[PDB]
Structure 1
Amino acid sequence: PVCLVVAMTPKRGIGINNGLPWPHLTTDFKHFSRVTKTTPASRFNAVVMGRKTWESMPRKFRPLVDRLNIVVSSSLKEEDIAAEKPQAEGQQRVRVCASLPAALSLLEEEYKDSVDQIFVVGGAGLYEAALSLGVASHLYITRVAREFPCDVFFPAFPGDDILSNKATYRPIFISKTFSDNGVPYDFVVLEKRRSSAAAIAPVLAWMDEELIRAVPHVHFRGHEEFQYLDLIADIINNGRTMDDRTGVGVISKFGCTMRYSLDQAFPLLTTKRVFWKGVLEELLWFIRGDTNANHLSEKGVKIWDKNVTREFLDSRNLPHREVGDIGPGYGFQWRHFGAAYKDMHTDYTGQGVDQLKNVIQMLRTNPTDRRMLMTAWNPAALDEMALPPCHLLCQFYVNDQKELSCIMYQRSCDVGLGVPFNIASYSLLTLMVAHVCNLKPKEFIHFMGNTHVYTNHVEALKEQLRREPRPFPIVNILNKERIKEIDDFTAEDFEVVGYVPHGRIQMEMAV
């Protein structure tokens, strides 16, 4: 009964030139350190490594303190290690054996009472050995989300779908995404599968009085994507079947909340590929105050097309609107609130209230002010819009450490399709503002009104809730020096890093 501890790229790479492939992952080191050391008294833990693995270690850290170090080697002897450095008091002497099966017997022989848990700690030779012999009950894996040049690899195994797209190992633990030196990563654990309260109790018994789950086997649910997945399950389990403007049926709930950290990684949902080109192109479009949808479509982003066709414009009772014109919609209200709309071709510069600019000026000069809001809802103009805004309001907030948070309120949420797009969209806006105001991005908070999954998406979502999420990627702003105002960002000023989502899922847009 042994455990495998590893840090590992999506392609199972683990080393290069007898060393680590990535810059230092401090939190990984701390995690590895804690896992291999902590115990429920008299007992300590055993770390088993290979020669190359022992040798790669900086001399400062070998031998691994408070732990019975063991090396598997044919060519090195117990004296080489005893003479490599002078030993310190309070530790066991490193022991060397022919193979892993041999190295295990040594633990059964001499250390039958001293040690608690055993850990195979590297490298490819030993990990492979343990997998063959099937004594490994658990895998403590650090998924490095970025790809790195490698010559040494972790052997393939049943259930390596947790790494990338293609007696088993199923995930039982998935942590939130951490990042160090511009490298996003997280921790999984895969398991080998193949009367002070008595008085209250019966009162609870009569009170309770009356199905679908996301990745049910995953018990510790650190990953923040669980919010979205538990939110899906919830609506399907406890929603209410409604009719619709569209004619397509709906299961809905009212009043919902997720929030996402922006300091370590970016919440680009990993359980299905998010059309990021679309969120970027559209957010840029918003910020310009552009209301011509053809500018999006010509760039290969057809998200608004169905909602600006000749047919739809007339159902919405706007025969005079050119094909493409979303009326005075989201962008317009951000940049020219309450201005008199004409068409998508008109220049509205200096007109209306520039909510966006005001929000930034306030952020830069008086960040304690509680009137840092931007609204898209304009009662007077709703009829002129092709579609009333879903995400209609956002508030910004700064704390002590110059960390920026953003709340967005959405009236009507398409959970299968719209939500992950809207999460990534406003999380990006936060990064943009944070940079321009000289603030650290902290948190994005999602406030939802009518929250619904369409009945024709239900089949497809059940498939999605079997998928265990991958580590969130990092979004970087490039050209950090060139960009000084919110209007200075372009499509080329960003780079998604480490995005390894699951394959695409087709969902029809309710027209």
Structure 2
Amino acid sequence: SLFKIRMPETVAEGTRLALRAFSLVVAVDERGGIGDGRSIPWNVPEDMKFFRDVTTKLRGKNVKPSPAKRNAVVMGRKTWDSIPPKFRPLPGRLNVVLSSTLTTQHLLDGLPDEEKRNLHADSIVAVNGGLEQALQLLASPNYTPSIETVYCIGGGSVYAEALRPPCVHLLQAIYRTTIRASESSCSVFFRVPESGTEAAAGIEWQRETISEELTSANGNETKYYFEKLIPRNREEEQYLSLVDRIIREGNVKHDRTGVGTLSIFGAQMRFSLRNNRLPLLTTKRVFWRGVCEELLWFLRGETYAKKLSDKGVHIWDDNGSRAFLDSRGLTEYEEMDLGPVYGFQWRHFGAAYTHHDANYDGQGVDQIKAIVETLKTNPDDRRMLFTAWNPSALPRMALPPCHLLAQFYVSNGELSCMLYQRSCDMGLGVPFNIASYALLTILIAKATGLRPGELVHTLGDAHVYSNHVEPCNEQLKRVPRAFPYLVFRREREFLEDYEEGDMEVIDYAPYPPI
């Protein structure tokens, strides 16, 4: 306990979600109009179907909406009133209504009968505020992470709030149907701000998809099309442009097997960790549970990989086997005893390692505890770094450290981190390490009374394996989506006590397998 890092009284502060991320669904005419102030002056059943499916369906396969896992739909009072009483609430979704007039009971009182009220009791909530207040409520443990995706559907006032800060920064996707008509009957309008405009607040909107022009079977042959707009993700673009550079200009190298590689030397990337943001790459899914479990394992100063494999994390299995250890001369280590790797050096630098069973408390230099104490007392210190690169210990490690050094910096109450990585597998390793040092920085922020800032990633030998070239090249076609967020469901007394189940990654919508 004396050797552990005690979390400050402000643990959940500076990590708590202010607003839940959301997507937006809207239909417009070509003049950008949405309604007359009361209803919608066109009828395209095909769009009503799309609206239903996009807001109703969960991500993935064979899904079933439920009280424990469902989508939420946020609307204004006038939008609620525009739904015919028999068709409301919107089935299979949590209906969040914004209103200063009506309470949650008032909304139920507007339902035809008691049977409908008793049944749909759990599926209707009133918020006395705007969309921001709703996102604050949907950021609550009761709703986060039970609600998979929030959808704003909400009408001009709510749309306007959605497209302006602070809410627009939480907007992951705009699903926009355009009706080919110029309706004069429209009094309410909708517009998305353009790339370099003041109103865009630094967001660059671009289309992921646009459909062909379609014809409605509504009797009027009305033309319409679909668009999905997403906020340009320049941070993931860094990683993609590096991959592309490696393919096009990288030197051919061969590793310690004769396995071919394309590589460059010297690169740098940056990622915002502010306001719960988590740089998990979207163009290819990251094994977050592995990232999380292993980072905690590092932080504890652990060396027994069986603690990972017992948790279904098999990333170290091949490097912990009898055959592999033996091939490094480590004939005395039991299987899965990796030696004094990584987090052992973080917590116990220079300590004399023999086996994982030994008790290393207070042995070596605890670099992480030293950093935490410095951060809370003199955050402007320029020596706040730790290393796993220990030439004295290297020969007795299963693997020499890859991500080998990290340095901290503080500005405006924000903690930033620079990672140094000597050898960077772009296809699989790099996205994993970005997620890993994002988590670390967030946890150190919580341990020190600071808000998370930025992750800087310095790469040495950045490379793409021979068999990754073609997959990675097809991945380059994908337009990066908005990043997920990290949320803590509970806290701990000590940093070392944190569990993978204490936190949840929300609003992670990566592209399917290549």
Structure 2 length normalisation: TM-score? 0.61
**2:503 is the counterpart of 1:503:** no
2:500 and 2:308 mapped to 1: Cα distance? 12
1:380 and 1:296 mapped to 2: Cα distance? 26
1:456 alignment partner, one of 467, 473, 476: 467
* Equivalent position of 1:260 in the other structure: 271
* Equivalent position of 1:477 in the other structure: 488
Q: Note if contact 1:390-1:410 (Cα within 8 Å) is conserved in structure 2.
A: yes
Opposite residue 439 of structure 2, the aligned amino acid is L
1:382 and 1:442 mapped to 2: Cα distance? 32
Q: Which has the higher contact order (CA 8 A, sep 6+)?
A: 2
Matches within 5 A, 1:6-155: 12-13=54-55, 15-16=74-75, 18=79, 21=96, 57=157, 101=181, 103=183, 121=190, 140=192
Q: 1:5 to 1:281 in 2, by over 3 A?
A: farther
**2:411 is the counterpart of 1:430:** no
Q: Note if contact 1:271-1:501 (Cα within 8 Å) is conserved in structure 2.
A: yes
1:468 and 1:317 mapped to 2: Cα distance? 46
Q: Note if contact 2:340-2:393 (Cα within 8 Å) is conserved in structure 1.
A: yes
1:237 alignment partner, one of 229, 234, 248: 248
1:186 and 1:496 mapped to 2: Cα distance? 24
Structure 2 residues without counterparts, runs of 5 or longer: 1-28, 35-49, 56-72, 81-94, 98-126, 136-152, 162-178, 213-228
1:10 and 1:421 mapped to 2: Cα distance? 35
**2:382 is the counterpart of 1:370:** yes
* Equivalent position of 1:87 in the other structure: none
1:11 and 1:463 mapped to 2: Cα distance? 29
1:318 alignment partner, one of 320, 327, 330: 330
Opposite residue 407 of structure 2, the aligned amino acid is Q
Q: 1:187 to 1:12 in 2, by over 3 A?
A: farther
Q: CA deviation at 1:188?
A: 3.6
Opposite residue 321 of structure 1, the aligned amino acid is Y
1:296 alignment partner, one of 280, 285, 308: 308
Two-structure CA RMSD over aligned residues (Å): 3.9
1:222 and 1:4 mapped to 2: Cα distance? 26
Q: 1:192 to 1:330 in 2, by over 3 A?
A: closer
**2:370 is the counterpart of 1:358:** yes
- Which SS does the other structure have where 2:274 is aligned? coil
Opposite residue 30 of structure 2, the aligned amino acid is V
Q: Note if contact 2:297-2:343 (Cα within 8 Å) is conserved in structure 1.
A: yes
2:52 and 2:430 mapped to 1: Cα distance? 27
1:383 and 1:357 mapped to 2: Cα distance? 26
Q: 1:341 to 1:232 in 2, by over 3 A?
A: same
Q: Note if contact 1:250-1:455 (Cα within 8 Å) is conserved in structure 2.
A: yes
Deviations 1:195-238 (A, max 9, x none): xxxxxxxxxxxxxxxxxxxxxxx999543211111111111111
**2:398 is the counterpart of 1:398:** no
The 10-residue stretch of structure 1 (332-341 or 243-252) with the greater mean CA deviation from structure 2: 243-252
* Equivalent position of 1:205 in the other structure: none
Deviations 1:465-484 (A, max 9, x none): 122222111101232xx435
1:5 and 1:471 mapped to 2: Cα distance? 27
Structure 1 length normalisation: TM-score? 0.62
1:3 and 1:339 mapped to 2: Cα distance? 71
* Equivalent position of 1:337 in the other structure: 349
* Equivalent position of 1:2 in the other structure: 30
Matches within 5 A, 1:377-396: 377-396=389-408
Q: CA deviation at 1:57?
A: 3.9
Q: CA deviation at 1:15?
A: 4.9
* Equivalent position of 1:114 in the other structure: none
The 10-residue stretch of structure 1 (464-473 or 12-21) with the greater mean CA deviation from structure 2: 12-21
